[PDB]
Every structure is written in C-alpha cells, then in structure tokens.
Amino acid sequence: MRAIYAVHKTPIPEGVKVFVRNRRIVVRGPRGTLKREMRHVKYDMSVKGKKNKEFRCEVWFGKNQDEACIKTICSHVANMITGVTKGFRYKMRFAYAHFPINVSISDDGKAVEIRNFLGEKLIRKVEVREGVSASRTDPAKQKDELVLEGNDIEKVAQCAADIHQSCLVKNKDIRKFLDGIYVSSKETVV
RNA sequence: GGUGUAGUGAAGCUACCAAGUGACGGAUACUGACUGGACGCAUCUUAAGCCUGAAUCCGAGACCAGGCCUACAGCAUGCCUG
Numbered sequence: 001m002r003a004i005y006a007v008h009k010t011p012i013p014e015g016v017k018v019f020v021r022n023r024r025i026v027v028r029g030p031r032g033t034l035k036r037e038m039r040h041v042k043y044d045m046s047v048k049g050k051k052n053k054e055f056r057c058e059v060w061f062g063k064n065q066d067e068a069c070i071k072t073i074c075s076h077v078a079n080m081i082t083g084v085t086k087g088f089r090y091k092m093r094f095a096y097a098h099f100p101i102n103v104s105i106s107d108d109g110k111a112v113e114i115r116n117f118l119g120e121k122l123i124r125k126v127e128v129r130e131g132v133s134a135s136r137t138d139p140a141k142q143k144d145e146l147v148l149e150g151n152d153i154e155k156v157a158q159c160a161a162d163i164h165q166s167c168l169v170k171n172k173d174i175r176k177f178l179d180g181i182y183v184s185s186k187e188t189v190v
Numbered sequence: 191g192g193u194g195u196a197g198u199g200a201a202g203c204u205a206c207c208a209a210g211u212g213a214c215g216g217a218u219a220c221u222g223a224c225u226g227g228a229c230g231c232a233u234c235u236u237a238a239g240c241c242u243g244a245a246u247c248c249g250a251g252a253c254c255a256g257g258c259c260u261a262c263a264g265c266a267u268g269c270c271u272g
Contacts, residue, residue, distance in 0.1 A: 068228035157224050
C-alpha cells in the first residue's frame with residue numbers, strides 16, 4: 001500500500017524564520033542560526049504560511065517508513081526551532097562513592113577534563129563540539145554539576161553522552177560501583 | 191709423518207655466547223550510546239540521521255621488490271646525435 005499523500009506539519013513561532021530549499025533547512029532565531037541538510041531523503045519539506053507559518057514535510061506515494069520519516073524530519077525541525085528560541089541545556093550530575101571526580105574545563109571552552117574518576121591515574125579528556133558551551137556550576141547551586149548548553153540538541157546531547165561514555169566503569173559489578181557523570185535533566189535555557 | 195703435536199695467536203667469520211634496533215593512523219565488528227519516529231508514550235535504528243572505535247581489515251604509518259595505455263620501456267635531467 002502506497003498512500004497517495006502524507007503530510008506532517010510543524011507550526012513555526014513568530015520571530016523565527018525557517019528557510020528550506022533543496023531539503024537544506026536553515027533556521028534563524030534570537031538565539032542564533034542552525035542548518036541541517038536532510039538530503040538523505042526525497043521528500044518535499046516546504047514552508048507554507050504567511051500569517052501563521054508551518055513547515056510541512058510531504059511524501060507522495062510513500063510507505064509507512066516514509067510516513068514515519070516525515071514525522072522524524074518535522075521533529076528535527078521542531079528541535080531546531082527550540083534550539084533557536086529557548087536553547088537546550090543538559091545538566092549532568094556527578095556520582096561517586098569514594099573518589100571525588102574532579103572535572104575541569106580547559107583553557108578554551110573545549111576539552112572537559114575528568115581526573116580521579118575512580119582513583120584511576122588516567123585522565124579523561126573530552127573535547128566538546130564547537131557550538132556547545134560546558135560550564136561547571138558553583139557548589140552553592142548544586143555541587144558536582146556540569147551543564148552543557150547550546151542551540152543544537154544533537155551537539156549538546158552528544159557532548160553529554162561523550163562525557164558519560166568517558167566516565168564508564170570496567171571490570172566491576174556495575175550494580176555496585178555506581179560512579180559516573182549522569183544526565184540529570186534535559187532542560188531549556190529559555 | 192697428507193696440518194707431527196701441545197701454548198698463545200692477529201685478521202676474518204661468527205654467537206641472545208657479544209652489540210644494537212623494532213612509535214602508530216584510518217575504515218570498521220560485537221557492542222555501548224545520542225537525536226528520533228513508526229506506535230501522541232517509549233525506543234541505539236529489529237527505520238532514516240548521528241557518536242565512539244577491537245591484537246581482525248587497510249595504510250610508504252614504518253618497511254621489501256619494482257615499470258602502470260599519462261607507461262611495449264613513463265617523469266626530470268647531462269652529453270652525443272639526427
């Protein structure tokens with residue numbers, strides 16, 4: 001079965017403009033600008049409003065995988081809208097039983113550093129993507145807390161996952177030894 | 191007495207019996223994840239899209255031999271010759 005038509009729409013807020021051409025979606029906004037070349041697919045991806053604008057992704061004679069990938073493209077564009085309007089901010093909380101994980105953002109913005117993870121003398125260097133700021137929160141607000149804020153949910157969440165996978169536990173029962181840096185919340189910078 | 195026979199014996203050969211020399215990179219596997227639908231949720235993807243990156247594979251990364259219709263004798267170049 002091939003549906004003659006399927007469309008998924010994403011309402012665009014005011015103050016944000018979503019340009020799209022050749023399936024290269026560019027999104028402007030107060031927090032900045034994003035681009036995404038969703039050219040690995042062959043769908044319509046237009047913006048079709050004057051008063052209240054919407055990004056509509058359409059597929060003509062597609063299959064259920066197309067009716068699903070339309071929604072995932074629309075969701076990516078909605079996350080770009082969020083990243084340019086309110087921004088993304090992932091808060092990672094440190095967890096350690098005996099050895100204080102000492103985290104240090106390097107000279108530039110990049111390169112989070114993890115030392116004394118589980119007593120190990122290794123040092124975990126995680127050089128963050130450009131487009132995402134990592135800042136260590138002061139212990140008054142919340143001790144043992146890093147926050148990664150940006151305009152690209154992909155970049156921010158992948159930096160969070162990179163810090164996570166840098167602080168992993170090997171050769172031990174991971175039901176015990178629960179140490180690591182864990183994403184405590186996926187918030188917005190608003 | 192086919193080097194008569196003990197001692198030392200240079201040179202050469204030679205010995206983990208002496209002396210030295212032998213960092214790694216990339217694409218990836220099983221995974222483990224991120225964004226994320228289908229399936230209002232959730233889901234690593236048993237879907238697109240992405241992250242990592244195994245002694246295996248690939249690498250002048252180091253190495254060994256060399257002739258490829260740009261080459262049945264190719265590039266540069268010295269001199270002789272047409």
